[PDB]
Ligand binder design. Structure first.
Ligand SMILES: Nc1ncnc2c1ncn2[C@@H]1O[C@H](COP(=O)(O)OP(=O)(O)O)[C@@H](O)[C@H]1O
Ligand SMILES: Nc1ncnc2c1ncn2[C@@H]1O[C@H](COP(=O)(O)OP(=O)(O)O)[C@@H](O)[C@H]1O
Ligand code: SF4
Ligand code: SF4
Ligand SMILES: [Mg+2]
Ligand SMILES: [Mg+2]
Lengths: 283, 283
């Protein structure tokens, strides 16, 4: 068996940091994992590969001739813990559709047998600011059964979580795409954990983990590593191991109940997030 | 004469707060302004209209029959300082193209003569996480001559600024779309002003204003107002008046020089943004 998972969320919310660290923790447990980068930023695999980034399927297809010309053994790259890595890429700004590379990449990986019987997990790291074109494809075409949304007490982050949830509902008449959980990537603000638990409950899911804000992430990433590899003893390494454990153990996969903007505003005001003057722990 | 301006930037960076406050300051000066919301979040006019939000052209066209059926006098709404307001709207998550409403809205406003000879400014408030479909239309179809990008020391915010700049370059062989400036929306971090000045210089533009992080924004917005209307004496009201003055006075409109991710990473490391442990002013 293999579990096809996607990590969605607004830009800069922590999808790639959270995904690569979660996947490093899964590899540390003995899981076989593939990361498929589905964000035009195309740095979703750099911490596994110890690299600047990774050349994209779009770039490699352009050099080879066509995508069907590429070899999977030439495309996939293995890094920390034997984690397999691939980047979709996408057109330059202002051209066609920012998500078109995701469609090409997932279809190529499926056609060429990348989904080996011994993989335990695939994680798609997907841009979530718009739910359309190739960014919607993992939901619309039933590629990722378990959606985990990285979010925070930020209105935009919660709005994005709600829109991804609407996408899941839209396509629920076929396939098996479900919301698996919210991951709160901390803004170091009072009652943020309570806020995302409350949002999860309104959507019908759970807050699968509260990831603290820890500057060790900046120190590991300057060195192109996951915290798991950079400092296995770090407090934050144990946080990603806890998230990985709860993902492995998770059995709650729902058709979510999207909320109104009235409900989103009520949550923010209920937990006093917009009335906070300073961080929970200054420094 | 009228100046067609667009405010771009990543989600949650401060486009709508900055645009509505800038435009309130322009109205306070005696300028005639229209805001065109080009973000599916569709809350780009609520602080001018004292409102929850505004019904969108897509919503109103669906109720009327077709868009060509709508009357401009029924669509535009005036709020604080006589500022005229309209929202594009867009399809539900998972459908067609998130930006399609922007195309319909701008074409309708142009056809129906919304661009009255007495308007001094139009501001499009445009989603900037992807530069494609209707989100690219204001650049591709020469609708906004002056692009101002709201950004911060956040890598994602600078990446977005660079991608919007690539879009401007892509379409520079026709029309007159130019980069007018970066607006730094402060994260209360050391040397962030210096970082965005340095980014502006590499792109060939300027940092037109450094907008401080001020919790008075949360207090005004809870009451559905700009800071300009909520508290005309506020320190932050004078910040938006300074931005408005520099926009009125700006004559630097360039074809930008997009940078590499290497250059973006070099900027972050040069100004020590990722090595900071606490905010510049705690609290
Ligand atoms: N838990 C965390 N603590 C500290 N910094 C974090 C944490 N999670 C993410 N970051 C930082 O936040 C920024 C954005 O994270 P990233 O995963 O690249 O976002 P996305 O992939 O959603 O655009 C990066 O600078 C990253 O190092
Ligand atoms: N200068 C500022 N100081 C304090 N809060 C701000 C400031 N600018 C924006 N905000 C807040 O940041 C959030 C996002 O701003 P918004 O303009 O809605 O972003 P966007 O339109 O780019 O998605 C809102 O909660 C807004 O009140
Ligand atoms: S939003 Fe990008 S192309 Fe449709
Ligand atoms: S990205 Fe949205 S439809 Fe092309
Ligand atoms: Mg990423
Ligand atoms: Mg907005």
């Amino acid at each position: 068996a293999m579990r096809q998972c996607a990590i969605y969320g607004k830009g800069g919310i922590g999808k790639s940091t959270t995904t690569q660290n979660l996947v490093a923790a899964l590899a540390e447990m003995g899981k076989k994992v593939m990361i498929v980068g589905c964000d035009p930023k195309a740095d979703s695999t750099r911490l596994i590969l110890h690299s600047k980034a990774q050349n994209t399927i779009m770039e490699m297809a352009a050099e080879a001739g066509t995508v069907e010309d590429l070899e999977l053994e030439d495309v996939l790259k293995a890094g920390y813990g034997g984690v397999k890595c691939v980047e979709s890429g996408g057109p330059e700004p202002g051209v066609g559709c920012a998500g078109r590379g995701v469609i090409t990449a997932i279809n190529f990986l499926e056609e060429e047998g990348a989904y080996e019987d011994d993989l335990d997990f695939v994680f798609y790291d997907v841009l979530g600011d718009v739910v359309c074109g190739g960014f919607a494809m993992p939901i619309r075409e039933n590629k990722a059964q378990e959606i985990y949304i990285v979010c925070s007490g930020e209105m935009m982050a919660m709005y994005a979580a709600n829109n991804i949830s609407k996408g899941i509902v839209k396509y629920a008449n076929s396939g098996s795409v479900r919301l698996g959980g919210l991951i709160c990537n901390s803004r170091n603000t009072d009652r943020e954990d309570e806020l995302i638990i409350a949002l999860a409950n309104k959507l019908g899911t759970q807050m699968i983990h509260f990831v603290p804000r820890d500057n060790v992430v900046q120190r590991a990433e300057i060195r192109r590593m996951t915290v798991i590899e950079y400092d296995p003893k770090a407090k934050q390494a144990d946080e990603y191991r806890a998230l990985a454990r709860k993902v492995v153990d998770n059995k709650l996969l729902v058709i979510p109940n999207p909320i109104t903007m009235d409900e989103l505003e009520e949550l923010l005001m209920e937990f006093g997030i917009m009335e906070v003057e300073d961080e929970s722990i200054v420094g």
